[PDB]
Each structure stands twice: as C-alpha cells, then as structure tokens.
Amino acid sequence: AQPPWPQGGQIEFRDFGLRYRPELPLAVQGVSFKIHAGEKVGIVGRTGAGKSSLASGLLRLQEAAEGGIWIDGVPIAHVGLHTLRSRISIIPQDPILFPGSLRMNLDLLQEHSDEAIWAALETVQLKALVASLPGQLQYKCARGEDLSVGQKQLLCLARALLRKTQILILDEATAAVDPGTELQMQAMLGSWFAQCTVLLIAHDLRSVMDCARVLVMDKGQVAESGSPAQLLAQKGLFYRLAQESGLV
C-alpha cells in the first residue's frame, strides 16, 4: 500500500475567493499562496480581514467563488466533503464535545485502544487531567459541567495525534483560555506535529512569531506573505500589527 491522500499536506490557493451567501459580495478574493508540506504557517489580520475564510474555504464550508484550492496537487473542489474533513483536523476556538464519553470524543470510530488514547493524552499533557476525571476515559461530557476551552483544544490535539492527520487548522483561542497557557500550547504544537502542516488562524500576534511563514489578510486580500522577520523587515501591516500588540 501507499500513503493516503494528504501525503505531505502541501496546500495551494490559486486566485481563491469565496462568499458566504450568494447575495453577499466576496469575503476574500484573489488569494494565492502556497503552503509547503509540513510547514507551520500563521494567518493574521484584523477582524473582518478574512482569516477565517481561508480555513472556511479549505474545509469547503463555502465553495470557491473564484479560483480554487489544492492539497498535494489535488483540487479539493473534486474531493468529497467526507474525505476532505476527515483528513484535516480542525481545532475551533471553542471546541464542542458531543454528549457521550470522553473516549468517544477522542475516538468515535473505536479504532484505538485505551492505551493509545492515554499515550496521546499524555503527549498534550492531559493524562493527569483525564485521570483525575471521574469516569476517566468514560467520563461523560456534554454533561453537567464542561472542561475549560484550553483542555478541549488539547483533546482536539489529542484526537489529531490519534488520527495522524497531515493537515491541522487551529483557530487560536481568545475568549476563555489563559493567554500564557494558550501561548504555551502554540509552542509545543511545533514538537507535537513536527511533520504536519499546521494552519494557525491567529487572533494574537504572539503566536505567529515562530511560524516559518505568516499570511497577512487585509480586507479580504493577501496583503503580505513571508517569514516573520521578512514581514517585520518590510515594515508593513504585519509590522504595524506587531506594534499595536506591544511586540514592537
């Protein structure tokens, strides 16, 4: 046998644009960038800049209005949605566990042993937390209470490790999780998914500083593209966004 479709996770946007409703104008347009296989890239921009729309387009939540998206040479427009979203791991800001056990949320298809699960939960340092939990792997989470947003992101990471997905879209947390903790997880994303392609939608400019390449969205278009040092060297929107965040 040969390795599955996201062999490397190389993503290419080719004059990409979409719209969320037919009446509405393009949310993004003319978006062209190529993410390398296994690259950790950050996606930055002001609110409304269309950060989400890239992830929204990659998952084909919205179809391409213009241009197209490719993953490892494969036009995702021709890939069935079930194939597209089972091979890309999406970590939302507020992940939602479904009613059921922790184990089901970590491994719905029952493809893994309890041991493998604990091994992944250990990798993201949730083994202690889940062990503390009453049912442990059988812990039921809607039920009465939920885990902190940070932990649900970790769980999503844990499932992503169990799935061995090649592509990882992470929408950076803002609202609930600790900024120091949320940033601590970003750092160890690099070690945990060293060979994965990771798309970080970033609402905190501190998380993109270690990326190999950052894409700067501005009013639905790609205003800047390059390494942080390059973007900072250009003294453009990324550099300005860094200033406003207190980094420069």
Beta-bridge partners for 214: 42, 226
Q: What is d(CA 172, CA 212) in angstroms, rounded to the nearest whole number?
A: 17
Q: Is 226 annotated as a binding residue?
A: no
174 known ligand binder: no
Q: Is 47 annotated to bind ligand? A: yes
50 belongs to an annotated ligand binding site = yes
45 is annotated as contributing to ligand binding: yes
Annotated binding site for ATP: which residue ranges? 45-52
Annotated binding site: which residue ranges? 45-52
